[PDB]
Every structure is written in structure tokens, then in C-alpha cells.
Design a protein around this ligand. Structure first.
Ligand code: HEM
Ligand SMILES: COCCCNc1cncc(CCc2cc(C)cc(N)n2)c1
Ligand SMILES: C[C@H](O)[C@H](O)[C@H]1CNc2nc(N)[nH]c(=O)c2N1
Ligand SMILES: [Zn+2]
Length: 411
């Protein structure tokens, strides 16, 4: 802008002023001579820990307008001494909830953040076993699902200590379908999960060898060998995909699960690392309809579908893929709604995100947003976020990526 940063919506000419980026700690990958905005992915000593701890506490106490208080100050000595003795420290329940809700709030890749303050935090820091993990996770799933009226939730397992005793949910999501490679060449189910399916089988999973087989949970507690568990099927809500007009759509036998629940990410609060912190909300229809169903590397159903629309697949210029994609996504939304399972369309979601974005600038002086991820993978320019300039930067607490457990743990 003039002296501090401005973003603009070119459809509405609204301008917003960003000051929040000046708090940004972490680094983006971009430099003054290269932009890495479209790049997917650009323990800790005692000494590294206290700055990060104090930085978080200062923020937490500044959030409740008690910055610089006795409570604030004693808490600082309290934690400083915890780190000398024990090389770590423990978050109060209140701080844990603040941290978690704010990690969501700072998640620059998430279009749903208008919901950020409405999150259930299940503290599972007392868990010591894979079995306990299974119990916490089942409870999360059942709570979150809520018989179709979805509720946002996260379950936080014990924090990392010496890198030799961390909790990992080896699953990328709590609920995902298996993927089966064949020397036939082809692949049955979800190909994103083929290797993971292999690990499960090479750990004794009795694979039904079907298309939409819900995978077992594979749970690592205290750094031990991970252990298999079948989520109770009655806890796994699913939607058969049919079309509001094309009654032949049922015949494709599509089904998806209703509960999107990410389980491979790392939650960072006050320098502490929670390597097992599965979290869930509800689906934007395009996640299933466009990416899950139509990505070439995923279920890849575009050919099968468009074929059954008497479509012109001779050349790409008929836009037969575009047509099939729109129908597939209509069927997804219709289905979830006919089943009274929470879902949002990309028009409504992006619309609420603009509102949220403007909310955040009003009261927080900004909102970090990653345009590349915020814009839906179909019909981009007819949603409001396509035309909205966005500033991306890294605030903390945060959810981070982390290595796949099978490329580390062994024995
Ligand atoms: C309530 C409904 C929610 C909706 C509609 C929603 C929507 C989305 C969408 C569409 C994406 C992009 C995913 C993709 O295209 O692969 C995403 C990413 C993400 N969401 Fe949200 N979300 C919701 C709830 C939550 C919650 C409860 C959390 C955590 C507290 C969260 C944190 C994140 C994070 C960390 C990412 C980035 C994933 C990555 O970088 O791989 N979201 N969200
Ligand atoms: C490939 O490396 C990065 C992995 C991409 N992340 C990613 C992939 N598929 C699905 C997701 C689900 C994201 C999500 C999470 C939540 C809590 C809700 C929602 N609607 N969507 C995330
Ligand atoms: C290359 C590019 O960064 C990558 O394909 C991104 C683009 N935008 C995305 N946006 C969402 N919501 N989800 C994704 O997986 C991706 N993939
Ligand atoms: Zn950049």
C-alpha cells in the first residue's frame, strides 16, 4: 500500500490493510527474488524452548488483556523452572485450548476458518498406549460425527519429549479407503493409500480387497511398535452417491465417508510439539467431488462417468470432462444433503471465508491466506476468493507437516 500492506478484492474494490504480518515469526520460502507460493512443502534444546514458550505465553496473556501481570509473570518463572529440571514443560488446559483454536485460526491453507473459535478440544495427554489411543480416537469420531450434524474437534495426545517416545497416528486421515495395487497393472480403491494399505497387510490386516474398504487405524504410542485397530463400522458414517436427476448415477456405486479428519500433522504450541493431534471438521463438496473422485492419481472416475452421459469424448474441446465434473459434484452435495450429513458447497464456503477474512482484518489486523489453496479446484473465478488478493505468512501456534512415521520408526 502506502506504508503498510494492502490487499484488494478486484470484483468489489474493497481494500483491507494488513498489520498482522509484522508479528510473523516463521519464514515462507519466498525471497525478494523468487516466489515459492505454489510449492507444496517449502528434537529441541532447552535453550530454544524458553523463547518459544514465552512468546506463546505473552500472546496468550495479551489475548485476555492481562499482558504483564503477576499471573503472567509467575507463569513465566513456573515454565522456566519446569524446563531446567525436566527439559520440557506442560501446558495448562486453558493454554492448550487457546493454542489449538489459534493453530486452526492461523492455518493459511484452510477455507473454513470462520468456524475457528467453535472447536472441541479433547485433552488426551494422559494416554500411554495404542489401546488408549484407539479409545480416544473412537470417542473423537463418534463425538465429531454426531449422527450427521458434524462438530469440529481435535484430540491432543502427549507431546514429544526425546524424539524416542512420540505418539503417531500412522494414518494420514482417521477414515480413508484402502488402495490395492495389482500386477494386473490397475488399482482398486484409493491409490493415494496403496503403500499404506501394504503396511497394514504387512502387519496382518485382513483386507476385504474391495473398493471402498475403510482402513484400520495404525497407532503408535510412546514410540513403540504401531498396532492395528478396526474402527467400529457403526461409528463410520458413509454416504452412497446418487444424482438428483440421473438415476443411473447410483449404478457407479460411489460412496464416501462423511467425516474429514486429518491425522498426520504436527501441532506446535509454545515450542512444544504434539505429533499426534487428529482434527476434523466437515467437507467442502469439491474435496470429494473434484479431488478425491477426479484427480488422475486418485479414483479417476471422469472417463467412466462422462461415458455414461452420451458425451463427446473424441476431443477435449467438447469440455466433456468439465461437464462430468459439474454433475459429479452436484451428486455429492445432493447425497450428503439428502442424508442430513453436514456438507458445504464451494460457493457458500468461499463466501463465508470472505466474511471471515474481513472479520479478521477488522479485529486482528489481518488474516494469513494461501490463495493457491483457498481457491476451489473447480469454477474458481465464479467464487469470491478468486478475485481477493491474499497475504500469506506463518503465525504460531500452528499445524505443520512432519515426516511419515514409516520412514523413521522401525524396531
Ligand atoms: C469446519 C469445516 C472445515 C472446512 C469446510 C475446511 C475446509 C478445508 C479445505 C477445503 C482444505 C483444503 C484441503 C484440500 O484441498 O486438500 C482445508 C485444509 C486445512 N484445514 Fe480446514 N476445514 C474445516 C475444519 C478444519 C479444522 C477443525 C481444522 C483444525 C483445527 C482445520 C485445519 C486445516 C489445516 C491445517 C489445512 C491444511 C491441510 C494441509 O496443509 O495439508 N480445518 N480445510
Ligand atoms: C500431499 O501432501 C499434503 C497433504 C494434503 N492435505 C490434505 C489432503 N487430503 C485431504 C485433506 C483434508 C483437509 C481437511 C481437513 C479438515 C479438518 C476438514 C476438511 N474439510 N478438509 C488434507
Ligand atoms: C502445485 C500446487 O501447489 C498443488 O497442486 C496444490 C494446488 N492447490 C491446492 N489446493 C487445495 N485446496 N488442495 C491441494 O491439494 C492443492 N494442491
Ligand atoms: Zn511468494
Amino acid at each position: 500500500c502506502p506504508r503498510f500492506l494492502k490487499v484488494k478484492n478486484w470484483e468489489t474494490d474493497v481494500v483491507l490493510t494488513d498489520t498482522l504480518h509484522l508479528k510473523s515469526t516463521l519464514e515462507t520460502g519466498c525471497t525478494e527474488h523468487i516466489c515459492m507460493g505454489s510449492i507444496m512443502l517449502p528434537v529441541r534444546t532447552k535453550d530454544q524452548l524458553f523463547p518459544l514458550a514465552k512468546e506463546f505465553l505473552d500472546q496468550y496473556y495479551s489475548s485476555i488483556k492481562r499482558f504483564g501481570s503477576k499471573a503472567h509473570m509467575d507463569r513465566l518463572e513456573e515454565v522456566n523452572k519446569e524446563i531446567e529440571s525436566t527439559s520440557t514443560y506442560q501446558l495448562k488446559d486453558t493454554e492448550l485450548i487457546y493454542g489449538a483454536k489459534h493453530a486452526w485460526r492461523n492455518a493459511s491453507r484452510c477455507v473454513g476458518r470462520i468456524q475457528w473459535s467453535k472447536l472441541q478440544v479433547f485433552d488426551a495427554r494422559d494416554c500411554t498406549t495404542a489401546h488408549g489411543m484407539f479409545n480416544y480416537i473412537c470417542n473423537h469420531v463418534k463425538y465429531a460425527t454426531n449422527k450427521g450434524n458434524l462438530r469440529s474437534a481435535i484430540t491432543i495426545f502427549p507431546q514429544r519429549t526425546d524424539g524416542k517416545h512420540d505418539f503417531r497416528v500412522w494414518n494420514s486421515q482417521l477414515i480413508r479407503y484402502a488402495g490395492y495395487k495389482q500386477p494386473d497393472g490397475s488399482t482398486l480403491g484409493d491409490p493415494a493409500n496403496v503403500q499404506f494399505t501394504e503396511i497394514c497387510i504387512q502387519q496382518g490386516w485382513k483386507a476385504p480387497r474391495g473398493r471402498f474398504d475403510v482402513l484400520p487405524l495404525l497407532l503408535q504410542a510412546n514410540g513403540n511398535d504401531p498396532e492395528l485397530f478396526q474402527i467400529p463400522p457403526e461409528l463410520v458414517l458413509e454416504v452412497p452417491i446418487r444424482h438428483p436427476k440421473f438415476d443411473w448415477f447410483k449404478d457407479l456405486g460411489l460412496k464416501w465417508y462423511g467425516l474429514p479428519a486429518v491425522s498426520n500433522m504436527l501441532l506446535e504450541i509454545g515450542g512444544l510439539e504434539f505429533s499426534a493431534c487428529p482434527f476434523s471438521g466437515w467437507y467442502m463438496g469439491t474435496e470429494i467431488g473434484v479431488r478425491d473422485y477426479c484427480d488422475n492419481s486418485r479414483y479417476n472416475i471422469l472417463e467412466e462417468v462422462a461415458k455414461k452421459m452420451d458425451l463427446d469424448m473424441r476431443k477435449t474441446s467438447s469440455l466433456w470432462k468439465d461437464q462430468a465434473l459439474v454433475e459429479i459434484n452436484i451428486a455429492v452435495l445432493y447425497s450428503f444433503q439428502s442424508d442430513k450429513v453436514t456438507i458445504v458447497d464451494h460457493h457458500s464456503a468461499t463466501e463465508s471465508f470472505i466474511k471471515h477474512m474481513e472479520n479478521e482484518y477488522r479485529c486482528r489486523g489481518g488474516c494469513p491466506a494461501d490463495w493457491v489453496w483457498i481457491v476451489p479446484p473447480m469454477s474458481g473465478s465464479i467464487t469470491p476468493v478468486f478475485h481477493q488478493e491474499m497475504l500469506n505468512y506463518r503465525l504460531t501456534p500452528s499445524f505443520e507437516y512432519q515426516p511419515d512415521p514409516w520412514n523413521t520408526h522401525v524396531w
